[model samples]
Target: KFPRVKNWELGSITYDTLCAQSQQDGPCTPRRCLGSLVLPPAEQLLSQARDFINQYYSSIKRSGSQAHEERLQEVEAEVASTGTYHLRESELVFGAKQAWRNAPRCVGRIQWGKLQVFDARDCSSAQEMFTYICNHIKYATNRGNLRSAITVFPQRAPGRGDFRIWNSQLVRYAGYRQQDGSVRGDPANVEITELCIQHGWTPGNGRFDVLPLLLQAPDEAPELFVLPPELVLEVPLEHPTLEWFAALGLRWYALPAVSNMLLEIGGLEFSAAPFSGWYMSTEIGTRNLCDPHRYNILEDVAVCMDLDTRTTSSLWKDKAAVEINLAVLHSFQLAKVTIVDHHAATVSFMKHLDNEQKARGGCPADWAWIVPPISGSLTPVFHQEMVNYILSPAFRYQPDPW
Candidate 1:
């Protein structure tokens, strides 16, 4: 027999199951399965907000301060009256920082308290959204010395849809499918490339062409805006010792600004929240450049190094990946751009965990994401038991806007 429902958060059960398995034989038998009742969207928001508010205050050693109670009451009263409410500027800033702090998938939480929050809730048009994003890019890019920041648009409301940015990140290359059925740039961006083309964007036939921003306001179609080249800081990939590697003509942006993730604070969703952090070398070297679905440059790099590519036992892919990662780290250092290697980042994360244990009782983390893809067991986080859970003031993946 399957396990019975012990708690609401454990899992969900259907209405049919509740009816068929009912023990009470009465007109209101559904009442017996009250635990199985799903919370409405508004109530879900309220519940999450309450939990977060309590956690926020407690974490600061002010569990029942006037400010904490006032904020809690504000959330309750606003939700009770309008089914939604706007966060004040201070609350938005605090919530954004906490969201980054509580992000389970990020190993960069040590820098959570330093994130710059941009409030653009007053934006009314898609063009205004594009302008805000451009400013965010310019400010966060910071001329190669990248800074972590997040820009939050208006929250989702009843009787209206949410504002959204269609690109995965502020800076990503366009992928073009060639006549030979091969991808020229980033294969992962093929669908977005098609969308950009449909919106009258003239995509270039290059391996590193930057895609335009597609900003969508509620009840309106998306508008494309090309980013000013001067605002984007990119580093040309090169090895410190390999002379032939410079001819590969590989490069990557200095900042990794994720544009599509939803920033959920309390119950409200900022669907157009874009956030950035300095890159870890493996994110570029191992995933972006080496993944089969991405640039797929492992074979080329390995061939250049003149390694045995015929057998898995040769560990050619592993060696090439390490060299690529090293090149990224070295290139960023040479350009004075902010970046971290996986080893350093994971070690920092370990310190963050220790700090949080004393400051906040515990830290929540995702094991799969915390462990770097290249050297899984080499990092300290790989051996640690991490607990993952949904926390308020968090960044989350949402459905793509087609």
Candidate 2:
């Protein structure tokens, strides 16, 4: 439990409490009392370590080596070669490293649990560790977080509460239960919702900002869960590295970074979410029931007239997706010149015709034209893969790759 702000017996308060009390009046008032705190400094250091690891891994992942030992050595070499460019360019890096230097001394002050490199002593530590792992996984080409930022606390901000370092929800469902005989979907299991609400990012007021309030729950709240600020920083913040790489037209280096971080944080025994490889390549009519391609089809081509409406709110209205599809089709055709007529050989060719029977579903029967829905989720990888296979720019249309 966090020490009470106004109580002397509770001992030194955290930077988050100081920030909280400094801005608000009454019980929530921001306190100027910054003292010898353990978690924040530790978290700060951990966050820096993660940031460094992220930069290191990104450079290595882009080069395409997958072996664990090799990747680790590659990351270490990249860090050495970069001459601390990763740290030099990041404010968080410097702060985190400084925080690390202070960790051993601060360890004596934290009385609740023995401090280790990785453990769930408190929310802050867990968050820091989790943050490190998530980034490493992203670097390994396993998968990326669709969203991040669900728990975190800032040292100072001109607001009622410390801004979250990470305030994103991660949902997992159980196909089966544990040996403890507990069900997975119980109310207590809904920690994501609580964290989202604490951070004020819950879907309300026609906005997603309310969900962050979940992370800000007070010590006395009925559902007492505390995740360290550093862990929160690691997972969500690491995502942005991928976002940056993607937006900047860099090879997605975050894949390896996430893989390495997971190993570091979880150690040799750490196991991550199983990778569901390359979902885009799944055939349209394949037996894979959960394949997104099978589900994204429009019932009727004629009824799908608005597919190219390009409205701002239309999630599928992507110029990149269209370009990617075209590239994939071109690559398919060029590679299988002999099987040019094969259904799977080209993106434009398909097996499923408009339902001649109009089917019981709302689909049209014997439609004059067969329209293919754009699967935006699958195209980016296809485009990148095309570039990799052909050893040419995917966006050859662009004068500059970036």
Candidate 3:
């Protein structure tokens, strides 16, 4: 069975046979359709292993060959003997990229094939994980010309605890709950900041203080590691025309590395595989700076610009947020950082959709997340009706390591 996808803007249609390959059923059934819900793993180890091995060989145009059959049998034998299996280095590379390609929430899948995969399967302790993570950050940051990368720590074993990166992201601003019943920093990170403090971190008073890493190894408690400030690259936000905007003193990190995601290759799970890609302008400007729960700078900027705020018809928020977006784009451009504007990002996603349509029967896409935060209708993704399904060799969310 195939799902039909349509581009309402272009009046074009395509059937997604790729959805048939989905291993897991989504939130749709006879009971109700919860596709609009924001929040959303694995396996009879051997069958998944066989499917993935078959996929790997198929990818290299060697499916059904003697070597391919032998590899499948080899994986089955290993799993049957040890209750687990491992992927070879080249298989890891292909699996990592396939995971990126299967990510439905990412709007920047156009660069999926260019990701740099690092294997840290031999890591033995939290300290070693920290070193690998630091290397990952340094390499991905690349002094502002960011690159997409992921470093996979050791896989979970049967008799041991899972490896974990406690923070949501590799680099994140701390959130301090003030005595005045207000948050002074990025409120989204307050929990992690408090956890870091509890783990012996000296909390900072600044609004943009970066939190320390909380790395955990199997059967061991989490260890705190302070990232070297020099290893992190950040850009100060400034407007091209609005001179007053420069004095706001706001800044953001260059690498958007998510640290808590688990990587699944065949049936093996890399629990602490942190991955990063460059940010899209709207993620910082529209969501981080302008969201009411975030920096909440729209009202301040509006007041600073002397825009009438007495009525809803003023569209002051719109004008103010647009300026903020422009400021972010301008600042990142001037800083020579790798960032894509919302318009350009969505336009590129359209091309990626086409490429995937021809390459894989269809591209799994989340209509809700694929669209940018701001300027929803102005992007081509807005008019595109997409089918969302689960794909293997994927990145999956796990519970917080509390």
Provide the TM-score for each candidate, comma-separated: 0.87, 0.20, 0.98
Q: Which scores higher on lDDT, 2 or 3?
A: 3
lDDT of 3 by residue, 143-179 (tens): 8888899998888888889999999999999999988
* Top of the candidates by TM-score: 3
Q: How do the residues 1-402 of candidate 1 rate in per-residue lDDT, one tens digit apiece?
A: 322322133233211121232222321243453222212067876877787678668767789999999999998998888788777787788899988987778999988899888999999999899888888988898888888999899888778878999999989899998889999899999999999999999879999999998999998889999999988899999999999997999999998999889988867789999999899999999999999989999999999999999999999999999999999999999999999999999999988877776666566666778889999888877777665545567777888998
lDDT of 2 by residue, 298-375 (tens): 222212323544355563434333433333334333332111111232232111111201221111111111111334
Q: Native-vs-model 2 lDDT?
A: 0.24
RMSD of 2: 26.6
Off by over 4 Å in 3: 41-43
The alpha-carbon deviation from the true structure for residue 188 of candidate 3, after best TM-score superposition, in angstroms, is 0.4
After superposition, candidate 1 runs with Cα above 4 Å error: 1-44, 56-70
Candidate 2 vs. true structure, TM-score:
0.20
The alpha-carbon deviation from the true structure for residue 323 of candidate 1, after best TM-score superposition, in angstroms, is 1.2
lDDT by candidate, in order shown: 0.83, 0.24, 0.91
